[PDB]
Design an enzyme around this catalytic site. Sequence first.
Site, short mmCIF file in Angstrom:
data_model
loop_
_atom_site.label_atom_id
_atom_site.label_comp_id
_atom_site.label_asym_id
_atom_site.label_seq_id
_atom_site.Cartn_x
_atom_site.Cartn_y
_atom_site.Cartn_z
N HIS A 155 3.26 2.35 1.89
CA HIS A 155 3.61 2.89 3.19
C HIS A 155 4.93 2.24 3.61
O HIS A 155 5.18 1.09 3.25
CB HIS A 155 2.53 2.56 4.22
N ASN A 164 0.81 -1.23 0.00
CA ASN A 164 0.00 0.00 0.00
C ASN A 164 0.85 1.29 0.00
O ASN A 164 0.33 2.37 0.25
CB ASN A 164 -1.02 -0.02 1.13
N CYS A 209 6.92 7.72 8.47
CA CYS A 209 7.88 8.33 7.56
C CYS A 209 7.24 8.17 6.15
O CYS A 209 6.79 7.07 5.79
CB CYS A 209 9.24 7.63 7.63
#
Lengths: 268, 269
Positions: free
Chosen positions: A192, A190, A227
């Site tokens: 991330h 996804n 992050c």
Amino acid sequence: GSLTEDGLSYKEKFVVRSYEVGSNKTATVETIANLLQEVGCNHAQSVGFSTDGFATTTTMRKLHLIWVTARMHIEIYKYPAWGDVVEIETWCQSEGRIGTRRDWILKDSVTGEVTGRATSKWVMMNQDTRRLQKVSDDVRDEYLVFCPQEPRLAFPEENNRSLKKIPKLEDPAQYSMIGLKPRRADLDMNQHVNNVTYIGWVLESIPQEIVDTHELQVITLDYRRECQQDDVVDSLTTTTSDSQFLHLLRLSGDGQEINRGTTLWRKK
Amino acid sequence: GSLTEDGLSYKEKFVVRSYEVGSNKTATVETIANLLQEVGCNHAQSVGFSTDGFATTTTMRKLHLIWVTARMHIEIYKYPAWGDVVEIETWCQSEGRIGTRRDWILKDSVTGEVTGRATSKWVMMNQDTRRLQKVSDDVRDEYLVFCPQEPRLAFPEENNRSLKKIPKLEDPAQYSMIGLKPRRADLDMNQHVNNVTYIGWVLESIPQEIVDTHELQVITLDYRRECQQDDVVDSLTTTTSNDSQFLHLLRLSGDGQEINRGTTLWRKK
Ligand SMILES: FC(F)(F)c1ccnc(N2CCNCC2)n1
Ligand SMILES: FC(F)(F)c1ccnc(N2CCNCC2)n1
């Protein structure tokens, strides 16, 4: 891998790979963390969770909710060697309206002995606004179908390390590794940053002499903010002592905290 | 006694009384069990439970439900002496639909050291039909208001004694005490036999030589059926073992219907 007879936990065996081991030919703590995530995903799929990378329940999808890791705590007694088979058992538990927990036990497949244990705390988040929230009645009911109802903890001991409050590292740090950036291999399906990448970044500021002369025994990592793919991180470390360290990951620019943690190391 | 600062547990101090102690001038395990029940009642009253002898919630009174003890497990390291002050902390936890748990920690008020711990399992029962049942969503919600939401266990250890399965004693028993009957002092305010009476009855079949030479360290008692005011009980015991261990069974004197089963672990003084 498979759910156990009672359907309340899941087990899976992994053969440690050549590229998964460090200088002493045993699995790195990042290899261990990836295996915990893999057996966790295989357990979620077996009990009817979504298969899109978010591992959500029916009510969570209707309310636009996702789980986010708040804390990861891992304790290793023996790291499996290259070619060894490690068996990992995992299960979940509901913690009222606070959030949920996923626990793990690692065993040597040949001897049957416990070689490690881990626990993780998860909090609800609205996927759109990124705002944290409590767990609703409907979500607590979904967890009762696949979780043991009596307490089952990987870390039972009263006042054990897994629940310790972690302080914030004060400048100047004793050690640092600056300008860390994630590449595509660090992202999940996804896009991330994968949770294990942060463990690697924390470890980057530990001196190579410590890694060469000590084994990592315990790591406790708090997660505060994510992050992004275009963010840059600084990894800071200070000795607080066995050797013990205090850690802080912050954005390179504004100094916004993303993670804090501690590590405990034993001399080989 | 008082709820702690966070309002999720309760503490109370007790001065051990002259009639509460045994031959070695320390509290009996029955005195300890009475103190656990008393601090449990004071905690229930402080968090808004009924004050009629049944510790019920608003939903329980609406549905004619009551809690019944399924198991009591007590571990004592040091029994407080006559005149000593013992502090007891208690709290509750919801265990999904199974039932609830009440835990206790006992401390020496002077030294601050843990001198004992206990845990009890409770199951829902319809007060009229006496039929056991699961804990409903509304009752689980009432428990969330006064219980810690993260696990807090008096017995955390992996395969600890408090969760051990207890087998059924086979005839003939090594020891027995026959014809035990409750008197009015054994009944609670709702005319039911007090849970502590069953502990006393279990202990009645332990030989006096064991009591004279050993201290009781652990007692685990399962509750299956109630003894009525006009029932008669037989207490049976068999040694299963420096430590002595026994298996116990309480049954009705007439038909032999099981009322309780348990185990005790004793250490030489
Ligand atoms: F674990 C945790 F603390 F819940 C956590 C981990 C990671 N992110 C968050 N966020 C960031 C977005 N908006 C505030 C909450 N929070
Ligand atoms: F703990 C327990 F096993 F649940 C228990 C304790 C005491 N009594 C009962 N029952 C249930 C069946 N009807 C008679 C009363 N059950």
